[PDB]
Amino acid sequence: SNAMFCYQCQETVGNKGCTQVGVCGKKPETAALQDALIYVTKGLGQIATRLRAEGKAVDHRIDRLVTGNLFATITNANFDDDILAERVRMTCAAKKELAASLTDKSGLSDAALWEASEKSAMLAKAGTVGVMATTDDDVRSLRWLITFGLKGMAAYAKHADVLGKHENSLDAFMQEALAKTLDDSLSVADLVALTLETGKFGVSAMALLDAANTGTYGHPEITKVNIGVGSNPGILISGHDLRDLEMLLKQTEGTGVDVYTHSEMLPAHYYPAFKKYAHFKGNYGNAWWKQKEEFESFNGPVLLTTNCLVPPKDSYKDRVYTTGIVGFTGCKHIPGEIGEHKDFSAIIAHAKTCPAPTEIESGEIIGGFAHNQVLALADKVIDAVKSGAIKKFVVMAGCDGRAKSRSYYTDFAEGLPKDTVILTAGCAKYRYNKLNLGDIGGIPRVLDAGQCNDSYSLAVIALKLKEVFGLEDVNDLPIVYNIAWYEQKAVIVLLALLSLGVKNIHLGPTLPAFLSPNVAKVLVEQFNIGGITSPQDDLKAFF
Numbered sequence: 001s002n003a004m005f006c007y008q009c010q011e012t013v014g015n016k017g018c019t020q021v022g023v024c025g026k027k028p029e030t031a032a033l034q035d036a037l038i039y040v041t042k043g044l045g046q047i048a049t050r051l052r053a054e055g056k057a058v059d060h061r062i063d064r065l066v067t068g069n070l071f072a073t074i075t076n077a078n079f080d081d082d083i084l085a086e087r088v089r090m091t092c093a094a095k096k097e098l099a100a101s102l103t104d105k106s107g108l109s110d111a112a113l114w115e116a117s118e119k120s121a122m123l124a125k126a127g128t129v130g131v132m133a134t135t136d137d138d139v140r141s142l143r144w145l146i147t148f149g150l151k152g153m154a155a156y157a158k159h160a161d162v163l164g165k166h167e168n169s170l171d172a173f174m175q176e177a178l179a180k181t182l183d184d185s186l187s188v189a190d191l192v193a194l195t196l197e198t199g200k201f202g203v204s205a206m207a208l209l210d211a212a213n214t215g216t217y218g219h220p221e222i223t224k225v226n227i228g229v230g231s232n233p234g235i236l237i238s239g240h241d242l243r244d245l246e247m248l249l250k251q252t253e254g255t256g257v258d259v260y261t262h263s264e265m266l267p268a269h270y271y272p273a274f275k276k277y278a279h280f281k282g283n284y285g286n287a288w289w290k291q292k293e294e295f296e297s298f299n300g301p302v303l304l305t306t307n308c309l310v311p312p313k314d315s316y317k318d319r320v321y322t323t324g325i326v327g328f329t330g331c332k333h334i335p336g337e338i339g340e341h342k343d344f345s346a347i348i349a350h351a352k353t354c355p356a357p358t359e360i361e362s363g364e365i366i367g368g369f370a371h372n373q374v375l376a377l378a379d380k381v382i383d384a385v386k387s388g389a390i391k392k393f394v395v396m397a398g399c400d401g402r403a404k405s406r407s408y409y410t411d412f413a414e415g416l417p418k419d420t421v422i423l424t425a426g427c428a429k430y431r432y433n434k435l436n437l438g439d440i441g442g443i444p445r446v447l448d449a450g451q452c453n454d455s456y457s458l459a460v461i462a463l464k465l466k467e468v469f470g471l472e473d474v475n476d477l478p479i480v481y482n483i484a485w486y487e488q489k490a491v492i493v494l495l496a497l498l499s500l501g502v503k504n505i506h507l508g509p510t511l512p513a514f515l516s517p518n519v520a521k522v523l524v525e526q527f528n529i530g531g532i533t534s535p536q537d538d539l540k541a542f543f
């Protein structure tokens with residue numbers, strides 16, 4: 001039989017599924033606990049949805065449990081079985097209490113009713129509630145496409161909540177959609193509808209996080225970021241959470257410890273509020289997947305605010321700190337997932353005992369082209385399109401990863417004619433943001449809008465251009481979409497773009513294993529989704 005089944009990321013074995021051990025390092029009992037956690041979270045969603053329909057209140061603490069549970073099961077987020085098992089217990093306790101306040105308990109699912117306190121009972125239940133519990137290929141495909149989209153949505157909703165923003169309609173949708181994925185009566189048409197609705201609420205979640213980030217730290221602006229290093233001890237902050245960075249910068253003031261960013265923390269440099277801390281140094285290294293080498297050479301402690309964390313080498317494991325929903329057995333954790341005060345005193349003391357970073361490279365990279373900054377430049381962008389100086393934009397946003405085939409994205413970028421502009425967001429950027437690609441009329445040929453969530457800015461920019469040019473269809477803009485994906489935040493970004501009517505998206509380096517033949521056919525027929533081949537062939541064909 002199979003010890004596990006997981007197919008949620010781009011690197012899944014054979015582009016079919018991980019059945020023994022995850023390519024990411026996820027062990028079968030860890031995979032089982034995540035399957036059990038998702039199951040009881042869907043049960044909680046049903047109960048909460050029923051309470052809302054009865055006219056009864058559901059406290060925001062329930063919303064936070066749901067988003068934390070989903071985020072903990074994203075690829076490279078949490079490998080800690082003790083933490084995962086305790087989240088299962090907490091969820092069982094919470095949903096039992098909520099169900100007791102229902103007037104009518106009729107029609108509650110097994111997920112709503114089932115509970116366990118012993119890990120052994122959780123592992124046994126997991127075996128019959130995983131991916132392959134749904135027998136029909138199309139229903140399975142759509143249920144898990146939706147679930148993965150909801151994980152990405154929940155991540156963005158959680159970062160907004162950390163910064164003090166939440167919307168009842170967003171949390172209500174997430175919980176109702178989760179419940180619908182266990183309802184056997186829904187047709188394929190119902191589930192295709194729910195997939196597109198999930199994309200729409202993906203836009204809403206990204207809009208909420210955009211407002212939270214910019215409202216707190218200012219609108220991103222054009223910024224030069226040092227990729228070399230200084231000579232003081234440092235802490236390297238990775239992942240996505242800007243509130244964790246704020247607290248870390250405040251606590252390192254006056255200490256002699258510098259702060260550097262990694263991977264998806266690069267865009268923190270673009271926000272005006274963070275420029276006021278003199279000990280906020282550069283961005284160190286590249287995307288998440290190089291971290292076994294780059295965390296080693298950094299020498300100082302590393303703080304993971306979100307995914308992606310890879311199972312650490314023994315050489316630096318003792319200086320890895322996790323926080324929020326991130327976890328790895330044997331790595332120190334700083335508690336907190338709601339933006340509350342976190343005590344970084346131990347990581348700061350640790351940093352003072354470590355060597356300064358070993359430099360990988362020197363120079364700079366430019367970014368900060370989020371929606372406010374690009375709309376301020378809109379007249380000049382529009383003039384350049386009208387004159388033919390800019391012939392095409394290419395959206396190359398998304399996720400990077402390990403696959404050797406991803407040299408495609410570097411070669412594609414290098415081979416583009418010098419009258420094109422790359423638009424990016426997310427760690428996919430690292431395949432081409434240290435090339436020397438130049439500028440068109442002073443506009444850089446790579447425009448970095450920020451984190452994967454700042455794909456929102458790219459959509460806002462596209463819709464603005466549609467308006468100014470007076471076009472009926474967003475697809476009539478001179479934009480090619482060549483997006484790379486790895487984890488579930490890329491899935492919500494994709495669904496968001498589809499909900500906005502974007503066609504002709506080229507997705508790679510492979511297509512998700514969780515798209516069944518019939519579901520893929522709908523995406524091809526209605527949205528013209530395609531894949532990649534060689535960079536030289538696609539540089540001809542895509543244009």
Ligand code: SF4
Nearest residue numbers: 006008009018022024
């Ligand atoms: S998260 Fe990806 S690599 Fe890890 S077990 Fe799942 S499909 Fe496999």
Ligand code: SF3
Nearest residue numbers: 308399426427452486
């Ligand atoms: Fe926020 S984009 Fe998706 S892969 Fe892991 S950090 Fe990267």
